[PDB]
């Protein structure tokens, strides 16, 4: 099956490399990017992100709910447009399908 866990790991490397300040909103704030895999808070976030991707593909994802929760952290359209770019890179590096359609669904509620 598609190694979405590896995709998500690359996605967060790309995201925080380009926008390090985004990391400050997480429980792994301040942690070196190259060490995130050994961080408990990151492990949980990465898993939830993978789950969301599998939910989007499976048809169960609550994009409105996810959008609302991100607004609840002051994360909106600008951030998700930036994320769309990083995720496209991560998917391409793994021969995985692009997830732009899934991010657009979230953007439609932001
Ligand atoms: C590909 C785009 C993204 C996906 C699929 C995604 C997915 C998720 C998911 C599934 C959760 C957990 C929601 C829950 O527990 O109900 C979450 C939480 C969160 N996301 Fe995102 N996210 C994305 C982009 C971003 C970006 C760009 C930021 C910028 C700061 C961000 C910030 C956060 C924060 C701060 C939380 C809460 C973390 C916590 O509870 O400690 N996300 N995200």
XYZ file of N, CA and C in Angstrom, residues 6-20 22 33 36 42 82-94:
96
model
N 5.419 7.700 5.405
C 6.639 8.300 4.867
C 6.367 9.620 4.135
N 5.243 9.672 3.428
C 4.809 10.883 2.756
C 4.611 11.996 3.781
N 3.911 11.679 4.863
C 3.598 12.667 5.885
C 4.881 13.149 6.563
N 5.808 12.234 6.825
C 7.089 12.647 7.388
C 7.792 13.653 6.469
N 7.884 13.346 5.176
C 8.472 14.291 4.224
C 7.685 15.607 4.145
N 6.356 15.527 4.237
C 5.522 16.724 4.184
C 5.914 17.667 5.316
N 6.028 17.144 6.530
C 6.342 18.021 7.652
C 7.774 18.558 7.572
N 8.698 17.764 7.034
C 10.049 18.278 6.803
C 10.024 19.465 5.851
N 9.281 19.338 4.756
C 9.157 20.426 3.782
C 8.453 21.648 4.376
N 7.380 21.396 5.123
C 6.554 22.463 5.682
C 7.319 23.319 6.685
N 7.990 22.670 7.626
C 8.686 23.388 8.679
C 10.021 23.942 8.208
N 10.578 23.357 7.154
C 11.786 23.921 6.546
C 11.454 25.275 5.900
N 10.329 25.345 5.190
C 9.943 26.576 4.496
C 9.292 27.584 5.430
N 8.595 27.087 6.452
C 7.880 27.937 7.399
C 8.084 27.429 8.812
N 9.288 27.628 9.350
C 9.672 27.162 10.682
C 8.728 27.671 11.773
N 5.617 27.838 11.812
C 4.449 26.961 11.951
C 4.646 25.937 13.057
N 14.352 19.583 13.377
C 13.572 18.887 12.350
C 14.060 17.469 12.124
N 12.522 14.932 14.752
C 11.078 14.854 15.001
C 10.568 13.423 15.132
N 5.188 14.678 18.095
C 5.206 14.595 16.641
C 4.613 13.263 16.148
N 0.219 27.274 1.284
C 1.610 26.885 1.473
C 1.773 25.367 1.684
N 0.899 24.770 2.491
C 0.945 23.323 2.752
C 0.701 22.487 1.498
N -0.149 22.997 0.614
C -0.483 22.287 -0.612
C 0.783 22.075 -1.435
N 1.641 23.092 -1.456
C 2.915 23.014 -2.164
C 3.872 21.991 -1.554
N 3.972 21.991 -0.229
C 4.873 21.073 0.450
C 4.398 19.640 0.316
N 3.083 19.439 0.384
C 2.516 18.093 0.279
C 2.649 17.531 -1.132
N 2.525 18.393 -2.138
C 2.733 17.971 -3.518
C 4.156 17.463 -3.702
N 5.125 18.165 -3.121
C 6.513 17.705 -3.144
C 6.716 16.346 -2.480
N 6.124 16.166 -1.302
C 6.284 14.933 -0.533
C 5.664 13.733 -1.260
N 4.519 13.956 -1.898
C 3.837 12.897 -2.631
C 4.672 12.501 -3.849
N 5.207 13.503 -4.537
C 5.980 13.278 -5.758
C 7.263 12.507 -5.477
N 7.829 12.732 -4.297
C 9.063 12.062 -3.913
C 8.825 10.601 -3.543
N 7.560 10.199 -3.477
C 7.215 8.826 -3.124
C 6.398 8.088 -4.185
